[PDB]
Homo-oligomer: A and B are copies of this chain.
Amino acid sequence: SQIGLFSKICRVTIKTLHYYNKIGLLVPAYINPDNGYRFYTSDQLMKFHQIASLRQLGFTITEIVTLTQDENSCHIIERRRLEIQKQIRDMADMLSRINHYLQHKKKERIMLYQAALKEIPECIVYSKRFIVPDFSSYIKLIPPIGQEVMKANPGLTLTTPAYCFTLYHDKEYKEKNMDVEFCEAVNDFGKNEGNIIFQVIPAITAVTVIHKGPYDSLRNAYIYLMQWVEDNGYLLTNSPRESYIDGIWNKQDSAEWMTEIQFPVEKV
């Protein structure tokens, strides 16, 4: 049985037998020193059978080189089992997300927003929690709040990149008298002055949507994320953040403003 007859026995490629013999797994019985031909015996067929049996399970080749000779190694199978469990969970996640994408595209010709999960680190922020009558008044009150803090603390250095955001501590849709908390990430701790405090905001896994446009139409964005959380079975773990990237401070065009809504979320 030359390599061709063996490759037709196992229904495997000649390149596969070559690769195996190179890697050390399934070395043939006889390598003729005259011509280097590879001759296999039925024992190699029995060995290739279990090689293919493990390869049909998802085991990488390096795991098979450890499973075919180290007959005591059983933990490396439970490890692959946990990996496969994670993979089924992530594939179900992806499938739900794809179905939601298709539904949203069947609704409207244009996909306005696109959700993305990202891991946001913990960060040392200075914060001010207070009530606002409307959104515009809140936007107007932010800059003096920032100025007070940068003046009262010499050496206050913002974080690069500038992670400057807000949190909406309401649980229902509150149009006026919103319990809003403005925050800005700094390099390190400062001193509490006025109603402005400092705190450490924890790391989250947040589903985010970048809204490009004027602020008075941010509501749609929030609704979309809400729908995203309702459809794909995630759950809002904390108050929603809203991060400001571009705006009246960065670009004087009102239609080029960019804010990254971030729902802190966890899967259920």
Chain A residues engaging chain B, CB cutoff 8 angstroms: 5, 8-9, 11, 42, 45-46, 49-50, 52-54, 56-58, 71, 74, 77-78, 80-81, 84-85, 87-88, 91-92, 94-95, 97-99, 101-102, 105-106, 110, 114-119, 160-161, 208, 210, 212, 245-246, 250-251, 256, 258, 260
Contacts and interface: CB of A to CB of B under 8 A. Distances in A.
B98 A161 contact: no
A102 B81 contact: yes
B57 A98 contact: yes
A210 B81 contact: no
Nearest to A52: B116
Given A45-B258, A58-B91, A77-B105, 7 more contacts: A9-B161, A42-B246, A52-B118, A53-B114, A56-B116, A57-B97, A74-B105
A71 B256 CA distance: 21
Given A46-B212, A161-B9, A88 B92 contact: yes
A101 B57 contact: yes
A210 B45 contact: yes
A33 to B, nearest CB: 25
A39 to B, nearest CB: 14
Contacts of A71: 110
A192 B210 CA distance: 75
B105 A49 contact: no
A116 B49 contact: yes
A107 to B, nearest CB: 12
A208 B49 contact: yes
A101 B77 CA distance: 8
A49 B94 contact: no
A84 B94 contact: yes
Contact of A88 (B95, B110, B245, B251): B95
A85 B258 CA distance: 36
A259 to B, nearest CB: 11
A54 B117 CA distance: 11
